[PDB]
């Protein structure tokens, strides 16, 4: 009894360039399924026209993964000359008790390493400074290095917020409501990797494994711009 996100033309293009993974890495709906009206409790259109992702459980996800219209997986040169841009208008609700971090956008490599996660966190400590209820960028320092550089981007609001990720050459930038919050961070540690965007709800380290993470997107796109 759920309305499909494909009923809104603002999502047609990105759905054509996506497949949906739930609740783990396995694809449940390819682009043709998404365009044919796929909807479920974990992926549906709200009455005020948000694409809502919802998922429970540790490291579980309801997430779109970037695809080419050819049906090829997106696998662009992580540090190449073509710009890759993801833009999203995201409303992050107040999360259910027991939800501690939800990844909402990623740049992921074609193996096991996220270049970038943008996540809501209940609390984070960076260089001795603790922030609560914020939106965070996490950039992994290398494929063989589990450490990451973390940057607070925004105080959490429930208001619809515009997030833009720009990847070009070996640099990655993040703008939030038009303001650059991460300015050309180095990602040369992914030279020789290939990459793709993701968007949705990816539930990280919950303290209640039955609680639902929930993330809403009013607009979403990912594009190339050729140099």
From TrEMBL:
Binding site for alpha-D-mannuronate: 117, 140, 202
GO molecular function, one term: lyase activity
Keywords in alphabetical order: Lyase, Signal
Disulfide bond residue pairs: 78-195
Classification via Pfam families: Alginate_lyase2
Gene3D superfamilies: 2.60.120.200
Tree of life domain: Eukaryota
Domain Alginate lyase: residue ranges: 15-220
Protein name as catalogued: Alginate lyase (PL7)
Gene: PsAlg7A
């Amino acid at each position: 009894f759920y309305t499909a996100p494909s009923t809104e033309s603002k999502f047609t293009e990105v759905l054509s360039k996506a497949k949906l993974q739930y609740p783990t890495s396995t694809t449940v709906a390819f682009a043709d399924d998404l365009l044919d009206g796929y909807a479920a409790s974990y992926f549906y259109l709200t009455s005020d026209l948000y694409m809502q992702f919802q998922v429970a459980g540790s490291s579980q996800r309801s997430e779109l993964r970037e695809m080419e219209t050819s049906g090829d997986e997106a696998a662009w040169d992580c540090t190449g000359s073509t710009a890759h841009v993801a833009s999203a208008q995201i409303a992050i609700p107040v999360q259910e008790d027991g939800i501690e971090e939800v990844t909402i956008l990623q740049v992921h490599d074609s193996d096991v390493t996220p270049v970038l996660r943008i996540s809501w966190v209940s609390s984070i400590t960076i260089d001795g400074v603790t922030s609560e209820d914020v939106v965070l960028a996490t950039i992994r320092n290398g494929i063989d290095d589990s450490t990451a550089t973390k940057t607070v981007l925004q105080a959490h609001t429930t208001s619809r917020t515009e997030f833009n990720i720009n990847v070009q050459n070996s640099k990655l930038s993040i703008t939030v409501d038009g303001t650059t919050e991460l300015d050309e961070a180095d990602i040369s540690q992914f030279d020789g990797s290939t990459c793709y965007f993701k968007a949705g709800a990816f539930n990280n380290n919950p303290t209640d494994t039955s609680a639902n993470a929930r993330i809403k997107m009013y607009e979403l796109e990912w594009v190339d711009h050729h140099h």
